[PDB]
Design a protein that fits this description.
It is found in: Cell membrane. Belongs to the sodium channel (TC 1.A.1.10) family. Nav1.2/SCN2A subfamily. This is Sodium channel protein type 2 subunit alpha. There is one protein chain. This protein is an all-alpha fold and 21 residues long. The chain has one helix and no strands. The longest helix has 11 residues. The relative contact order is 0.18.
Length: 21
């Protein structure tokens, strides 16, 4: 129950992974 994701981290996963999945 730590600091869950957010509106930015959610759609930001595609920038850190770079359309990997």
């Amino acid at each position: 129950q730590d600091i869950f994701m957010t509106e930015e981290q959610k759609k930001y996963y595609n920038a850190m992974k770079k359309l990997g999945s």
